[PDB]
Amino acid sequence: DPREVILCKDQDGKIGLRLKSIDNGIFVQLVQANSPASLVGLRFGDQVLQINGENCAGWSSDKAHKVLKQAFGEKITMTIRDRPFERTITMHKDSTGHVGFIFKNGKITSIVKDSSAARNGLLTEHNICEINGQNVIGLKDSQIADILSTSGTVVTITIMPA
Amino acid sequence: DPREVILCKDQDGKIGLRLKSIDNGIFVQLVQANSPASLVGLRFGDQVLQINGENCAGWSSDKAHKVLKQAFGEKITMTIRDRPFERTITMHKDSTGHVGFIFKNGKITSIVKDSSAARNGLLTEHNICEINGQNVIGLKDSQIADILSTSGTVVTITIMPAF
Numbered sequence: 001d002p003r004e005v006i007l008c009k010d011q012d013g014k015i016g017l018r019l020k021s022i023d024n025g026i027f028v029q030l031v032q033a034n035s036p037a038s039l040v041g042l043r044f045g046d047q048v049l050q051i052n053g054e055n056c057a058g059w060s061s062d063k064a065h066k067v068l069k070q071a072f073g074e075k076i077t078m079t080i081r082d083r084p085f086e087r088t089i090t091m092h093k094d095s096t097g098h099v100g101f102i103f104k105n106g107k108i109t110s111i112v113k114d115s116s117a118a119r120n121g122l123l124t125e126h127n128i129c130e131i132n133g134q135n136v137i138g139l140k141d142s143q144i145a146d147i148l149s150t151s152g153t154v155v156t157i158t159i160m161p162a
Numbered sequence: 163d164p165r166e167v168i169l170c171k172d173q174d175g176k177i178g179l180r181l182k183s184i185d186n187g188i189f190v191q192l193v194q195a196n197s198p199a200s201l202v203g204l205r206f207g208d209q210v211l212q213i214n215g216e217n218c219a220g221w222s223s224d225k226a227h228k229v230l231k232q233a234f235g236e237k238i239t240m241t242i243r244d245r246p247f248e249r250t251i252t253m254h255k256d257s258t259g260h261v262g263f264i265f266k267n268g269k270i271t272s273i274v275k276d277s278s279a280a281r282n283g284l285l286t287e288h289n290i291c292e293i294n295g296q297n298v299i300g301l302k303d304s305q306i307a308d309i310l311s312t313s314g315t316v317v318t319i320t321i322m323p324a325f
């Protein structure tokens with residue numbers, strides 16, 4: 001159920017937020033580290049219904065960008081819907097340390113037959129958002145594979161359709 | 163949250179279930195009225211993880227139907243994850259009786275600017291599943307519009323991505 005977040009711009013503007021048009025809605029696509037957007041709890045995949053009282057419906061990505069650049073510093077209110085697409089799947093590493101899926105650019109592309117991912121019904125064409133809690137958005141595939149390896153048997157992955 | 167369902171085949175060996183492969187997973191695409199599939203609570207959007215202790219990952223819908231069809235035992239055992247893509251949006255009719263969207267083949271195509279659908283972030287390219295608890299999967303657009311006409315001010319709609 002929607003929430004109202006109040007954000008304040010930093011030194012020279014910039015909320016540290018990249019918005020994207022998807023299905024005539026507006027969604028958070030990137031959250032900068034140590035950003036006013038991250039310090040309030042904004043995450044990749046959160047829907048934005050309202051920016052300073054105004055509806056985002058039908059806004060193109062570049063309109064969403066322009067609207068944010070023109071907002072005044074000490075107050076930027078938004079109506080947010082915490083990751084409407086968010087799903088959380090738990091897997092169990094095998095003898096080789098493998099959970100059972102192939103990924104590319106942070107998106108699951110393949111499911112290994114007879115694996116943990118197959119038993120747990122992990123879906124392809126979904127972005128990996130969090131592994132065990134850590135934000136893996138924007139990370140290179142090698143870094144994601146690293147986090148997966150340095151984790152224990154139970155792997156709590158958070159996926160979202162792409 | 164996955165649960166094991168035990169379906170019991172009718173006199174025809176049918177269960178009233180149509181399946182569809184989405185993103186290397188198997189999904190329920192149509193549940194016939196008063197069938198063994200409706201009986202156990204299967205619904206459009208439900209993910210089928212296993213069929214008779216056999217993983218559905220990668221399977222095509224023909225493979226899934228072929229497997230349901232084969233092994234004509236009275237009991238089919240499925241592992242079901244309930245509607246993983248289900249989203250509920252509450253809108254309220256304006257002075258004219260409109261929440262503010264356009265649909266074509268049970269799918270939202272457009273959002274009217276400055277409307278309840280816009281205010282509540284309704285998304286296009288989504289299938290309407292339910293309108294105030296009423297199943298609309300399978301119904302024609304005219305029948306969907308009849309439900310909306312006979313609705314109160316509050317219109318609660320369950321939606322899922324079209325894919």
Ligand SMILES: CC(=O)c1ccc(F)c(-c2ccc(C[C@@H](C(=O)N[C@@H](C)C(=O)O)N3Cc4ccccc4C3=O)cc2)c1
Nearest residue numbers: 094097098099100101102103112114115116141142145148
């Ligand atoms: C049953 C069974 O489970 C099984 C069986 C045989 C296998 F070969 C594998 C398997 C072997 C290697 C991989 C590589 C796979 C990976 O390690 N995924 C994790 C989540 C995992 O599945 O553990 N990776 C690593 C990587 C790095 C950089 C770019 C892309 C990738 C990628 O796709 C995936 C699966 C898994």
Ligand SMILES: CC(=O)c1ccc(F)c(-c2ccc(C[C@@H](C(=O)N[C@@H](C)C(=O)O)N3Cc4ccccc4C3=O)cc2)c1
Nearest residue numbers: 256259260261262263264265274276277278303304307310
């Ligand atoms: C503010 C504001 O809200 C506003 C204002 C002006 C408007 F013209 C409208 C509006 C008026 C009519 C319609 C037609 C629209 C509809 O009645 N949708 C329901 C869910 C609703 O939005 O109430 N329909 C009816 C229909 C029948 C058969 C096939 C397709 C359709 C279809 O798309 C859609 C929007 C809505």
